[PDB]
Amino acid sequence: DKTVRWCAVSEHEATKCQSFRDHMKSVIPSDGPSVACVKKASYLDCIRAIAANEADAVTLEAGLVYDAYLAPNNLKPVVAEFYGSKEDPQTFYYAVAVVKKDSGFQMNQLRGKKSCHTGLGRSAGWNIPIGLLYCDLPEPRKPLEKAVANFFSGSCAPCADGTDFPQLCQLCPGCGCSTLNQYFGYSGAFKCLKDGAGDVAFVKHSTIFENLANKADRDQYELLCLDNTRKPVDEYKDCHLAQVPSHTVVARSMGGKEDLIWELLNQAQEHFGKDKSKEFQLFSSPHGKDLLFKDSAHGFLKVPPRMDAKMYLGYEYVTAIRNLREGTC
């Protein structure tokens, strides 16, 4: 069943990918799916490599799936992550704004505060919050990156160009686009908040639970709700910025190996899915969080035949992104 060339971003993911390869070989027969690992410094290099037929698959944050669809890449989503539980699979999650208790400010008082984002172009960390704050940003609002930099009084926006928009990396110099940057991703943005670098972290509903095991510690944090009030972190269903689509594995439109990608991942979730193995775990890792797949994922679901990015994401989310680039107040 041939080999799937997986694209790992940076060393932590590369290590998890090698383990994935090794463990799959020990359980899957020389007749089944195998995994090869291609290491890149950023997801952008992964999209390039896959379009150039040098790699086959990579799991992309949903907000990045739309971009990957554009030419000359035209990658398509083939396998989606799902969350919650196997009994009731959720193909969406909640974007929330975590803050520290007693910090004294609401959503409409974010101007001048310091922000921690999962990464530029990502759903919860960027598209949803910046989409909501768009008109609050000072003019000229284009380029958006600078308008955001001027709005806050220091930020960490992984993957943003620190040369053109220096304040966007004030909280994480260089704005590294990988786990090499300790403040990259959901847990990285949260650490940026915990460490006291930022005042707010735009992450998902499970993020704080993934980083603080004791409720007493979580009680020192809160969420910013859209009605300009705050609520406990366990009340995200009644205090979130929006619901967004699951992250998805993408592949080429031509000779993309989506059939083998699904076969690989479907067998992988049975052998190494949640609570399945004591040797290897697809959804966790001793090397870090959200490596290759999100830790909050509980399994995979195959994307319908030939579905493209726009259709996968849905009209509501697609409109948001488009309205982020355009915008009018």
Measured from the CB atom, the residue of 93 and 280 that comes closer to Fe ion is 93
**Is residue 296 a contact point for Fe ion (CB under 5 A)?**
no
Q: Which is nearer to Fe ion, 33 or 299 (CB)?
A: 299
Amino acid identity at 35: V
Where do we find the tokens 């049975």?
270
Neighbours of 211 (CB within 10 A): 19
Which token pair is 321?
Answer: 């992104």
3-state secondary structure at position 109: helix
What is the smallest separation between the CB atom of 153 and Fe ion, expressed in angstroms?
A: 25
Interface map 39-78 toward Fe ion (x if CB under 5 A):
----------------------x-----------------
Minimum CB–partner distance for residue 161 and Fe ion (Å): 21
C-beta of 105 vs 209, nearer to Fe ion = 209
b/e sequence 143-167, b meaning 16+ C-beta within 10 Å: ebbbbbbbbbebbbbbbbebeebeb
Site map 109..148 versus Fe ion, x via CB under 5 A? --------------x-------------------------
Nearer of residues 33 and 119 to Fe ion, judged by Cβ: 119
User: Considering the complex, what minimum distance in angstroms separates the CB of residue 122 from Fe ion?
Assistant: 5
User: In the complex, what is the shortest distance from the CB of residue 63 to Fe ion, in angstroms, rounded to a whole number?
Assistant: 7
Q: How far apart are the first and last CA of the chain?
A: 53
Q: Which is nearer to Fe ion, 39 or 247 (CB)?
A: 247
Is the distance from CB of 62 to CB of 271 less than 8 angstroms?
no
Residue 222 near residue 100, CB atoms below 8 Å: yes
In the complex, the smallest distance separating the C-beta of residue 61 from Fe ion, rounded to whole angstroms, is 5
- Binning the chain into helix, strand and coil, the percentages to the nearest 5 are 35, 20, 45
State which residue, 165 or 317, has the beta carbon closest to Fe ion: 317
Nearest residue (CB) to Fe ion, 123 versus 281: 123
From the CB of 276, what's the least distance to Fe ion, in Å?
A: 24
Supply the Cα-derived Rg of the chain in whole angstroms.
19
Instruction: Say how many CA atoms lie within 13 Å of 321 toward its Cβ.
Output: 21
Instruction: Retrieve residue 189's tokens.
Output: 């943005």
- Rounded Cα–Cα distance for residues 49 and 53 (Å): 6
CB of 123 to Fe ion, least distance (A): 4
Footprint of Fe ion (CB under 5 A): 61, 123
